[PDB]
Amino acid sequence: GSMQAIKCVVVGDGAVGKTCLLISYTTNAFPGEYIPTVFDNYSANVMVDGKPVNLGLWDTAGIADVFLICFSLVSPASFENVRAKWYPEVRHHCPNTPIILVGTKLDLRDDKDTIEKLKEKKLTPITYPQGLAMAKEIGAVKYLECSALTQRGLKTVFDEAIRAVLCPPPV
Ligand SMILES: Nc1nc2c(ncn2[C@@H]2O[C@H](COP(=O)(O)OP(=O)(O)NP(=O)(O)O)[C@@H](O)[C@H]2O)c(=O)[nH]1
Ligand SMILES: [Mg+2]
């Protein structure tokens, strides 16, 4: 053993939950404490489809094998920036590198008070069909929703980032 190294770079607007996504996945605990930019990258040794992989995860302020573009499901402004900023920025460096679109803070999309404070701003959470359509719009290989807090959807984000590298499409 013998494992494949895969580099994954995580981008998206400020406060969408990139750091908490990576820490929750790699330590299995949502961080209830301050996180100094001491760490800009995290690591996980994972088995996907019977294949041992060293997943290297690179965090940013909001050569990759795969990118995660993240937006908060309760921030329409972060969602618009997926196509306005993050997709063009990734594609200038890397025309072909797969992208996974990730909607974060899934626990808040059905949260009553987060729905109610948005409604004061004539905003509403991003729905699953809207996210899926934005993924098609930016040519993302997959669209996934997750909560770092509850860990719902969290493992699948990384499993899919890995499958995107290990199993590229025909062509
Ligand atoms: N309810 C909920 N809050 C979350 C979740 N993930 C992160 N948060 C909260 O969202 C805020 C931002 O999280 P953080 O991971 O620091 O975001 P970031 O994208 O790294 N920010 P930056 O780009 O500035 O470094 C924090 O208050 C954090 O607790 C989640 O899944 N659910
Ligand atoms: Mg951060």
Curated annotation (Swiss-Prot):
Specify the glycosylation sites in chain numbering. Answer: Y34, T37
Result of changing V53M:
In MRD48; decreased substrate adhesion-dependent cell spreading; weak dominant-negative effect
Positions carrying (Microbial infection) O-AMP-tyrosine are Y34
Membrane topology listed for this record: Lipid-anchor
Q: Give the top-rank taxon of the lineage listed in the UniProt record for this protein.
A: Eukaryota
Which sequence positions carry the modification called (Microbial infection) O-AMP-threonine? Answer: T37
Q: What is the effect of changing G14V?
A: Constitutively active. Interacts with PARD6 proteins. Increases nuclear localization and up-regulates transcriptional activity of NR3C2. Doesn't interact with CYRIB. Increases interaction with GARRE1
Impact reported for T19N: Constitutively inactivated. Abolishes interaction with PARD6 proteins. No effect on NR3C2 transcriptional activity. No interaction with PPP5C. Doesn't activate PPP5C phosphatase activity and translocate PPP5C to the plasma membrane
Please give the annotated consequence of changing F39A: Strongly reduced interaction with PLCB2
| Mutagenesis / variant outcome for changing C20Y | In MRD48; decreased substrate adhesion-dependent cell spreading; dominant-negative effect; reduced neuronal proliferation
> Is Membrane found in the keyword set?
yes
What's the protein here called?
Answer: Ras-related C3 botulinum toxin substrate 1
Q: Gene encoding this chain? A: RAC1
